[PDB]
Every structure is written in C-alpha cells, then in structure tokens.
Design a protein around this ligand. Structure first.
Ligand SMILES: [Cl-]
Ligand code: NA
Ligand code: NA
Ligand code: NA
Ligand code: NI
Ligand code: NI
Ligand code: NI
Ligand code: NI
Ligand code: NI
Ligand code: NI
Ligand code: NI
Ligand code: NI
Lengths: 22, 30, 30, 22, 30, 22, 30, 22, 30, 22, 30, 22
C-alpha cells in the first residue's frame, strides 16, 4: 500500500507523488 | 504530468527533483 | 522544489518529466 | 537569454520550467 | 550503434548527446 | 509517425536519429 | 570503489543501489 | 553535518553510505 | 543488494560506481 | 556466459558483480 | 555534437551508446 | 594521458570516443 504499488505497478501524478516528501 | 510508469532508479530521480530541499523517505515494502 | 542549479543532461531530464505528453523544446545559446 | 542562461547560470523553479514546454 | 529500444528518459538523454549545441524538438504524439 | 513509433516501438540508428535535431 | 565526490542526483542513485529493499532516507541541510 | 556535508563537500566510500539506509 | 534486473544504461552505471578507480571491461556478446 | 546473461537475463549481487572489475 | 566536457557517470553513459554491441573499456589514470 | 585527460579536463567529439570502443 506504499509507493511501489502505486507509481510503478499503477500510475501516479505530481500531486499524488508529493505526499512522500517531508 | 502525463501518465508514466516510474520504476527503479527513475522513481528516486523523480523523488529528488520534486521534493527538493525538504527531503523524502523511500520504502519499497510497505 | 525550492530551487537549484540545473545544467547539461540534468536539464533535459527535468524537462521530460515536467512537460510530459505536451513535449518540450531545447535550444541553447549556440 | 534563454533556458541555459536562466536555469544553469541562474536558478529556476518548477513554474519557470513549464514555460519551455510545447 | 547497435540496435536498442530507446524509451522515456533514455530517449531524451540520447537526443541531448547527439544533437549537441544545435538543439532538438520532442513531440511524443505525432 | 513520429519519434516514439520509430525508436521506442521499433528500432532506430544514429543516422535515423539525427533527423530530429535542429 | 576507492572514493569520489557525490552530489545531487548522483547521490540518490547511489543510495538506491546501495540500500535496495532496505530503503534509504535523504535529508539535506536545508 | 549530514549526508551532503560528508559525501558532497567531502568524500565517502561504500561503507559510509550504508549508514543512511533504513 | 537486494535483487534487481540491471539492463542497458543501468548496468554500466552500476559498473562505474562499484569498480571505481580500478576500471572495468564491458562485452555484451560473450 | 558473460555479464548480460547473468545480471540482465538473470539476477546478480554486488559480490557477483565485482568480478568484472580490473 | 560540436563538443562538450564529459566527466564521471556521464562519460560511461556516452560510451555505452557510442560503442554498443562492440563494447568499451574504461581505465582512469588511477 | 588517457580517456579522463582528453574528455574530462579537455573536450572530445563523437569520433574521439569511438577509439576507446572494443
Ligand atoms: Cl527501463
Ligand atoms: Na489533466
Ligand atoms: Na552495420
Ligand atoms: Na541476504
Ligand atoms: Ni500499464
Ligand atoms: Ni530505465
Ligand atoms: Ni550558484
Ligand atoms: Ni522488440
Ligand atoms: Ni551530473
Ligand atoms: Ni575535492
Ligand atoms: Ni525476472
Ligand atoms: Ni572548460
């Protein structure tokens, strides 16, 4: 349920990608 | 920015550019 | 990202992600 | 004055990059 | 230079190196 | 009929790749 | 490797390989 | 003093990198 | 470092980092 | 029997990867 | 390309494309 | 005098690179 099974297995955008920043 | 699959080294390169001075964590098994 | 210096191959890689499907146009000050 | 003058010698953000997109 | 598939970031990296000071356009939907 | 359906979908060489330069 | 200077996007790519499945944590001296 | 101070301004090896791994 | 497939440009990037000042050979058909 | 049919076709580790260095 | 300065990981990536299936040999002035 | 002396400290073109290929 992390970053791999979202952006690599599925697709993610810039605003969906910023959530992992500090 | 338009859809792509970001895997491996391309994912952490995108993370670096996007978060910038702030910083980020990377955990592949979560 | 706050900011940073982007030169060479790091500039075209940044453009590829930021533009996407739209596409970019790279012309240096020959 | 261009893309190399503004981003390489100087510093540019995410919204300055979008200007060079098609 | 011998055959390979150039896709994504690897395509624009090859474009940068090859055209040099001249410049190039990138349009994925043409 | 562009650059993707030639070098990514198919295969392209250095001289087939220079045509996209200015 | 003996040693070398690693800055920017070359640092996060080095961390991706060296850490792997463990994962890393990048925090610059904001 | 951190990861940028020790590896970018100074020089670090393979065993100094492993310390920043999770 | 944990398992991955290293192919193309990612293989020679890993070779550069790992061998360092020593040097290495690359032959794809052996 | 080289580097491709080991690290690309199959999988290889750091100690299996150092053998190709000088 | 006209010319440019190629150092570090940008040199081995340039060699990978330029040589191809032939292969290269990287030896720095240790 | 080598590959780093000629391409990193100095400047080299596409035809100077081909010399270091196998
Ligand atoms: Cl890939
Ligand atoms: Na949209
Ligand atoms: Na031929
Ligand atoms: Na193990
Ligand atoms: Ni898909
Ligand atoms: Ni790739
Ligand atoms: Ni500055
Ligand atoms: Ni195919
Ligand atoms: Ni660089
Ligand atoms: Ni120094
Ligand atoms: Ni597999
Ligand atoms: Ni100079």
């Amino acid at each position: 349920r992390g970053i791999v099974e979202q952006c690599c297995t599925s697709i993610c955008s810039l605003y969906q990608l910023e959530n992992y920043c500090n | 920015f338009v859809n792509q699959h970001l895997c491996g080294s391309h994912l952490v390169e995108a993370l670096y550019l996007v978060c910038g001075e702030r910083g980020f964590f990377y955990t592949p098994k979560t």
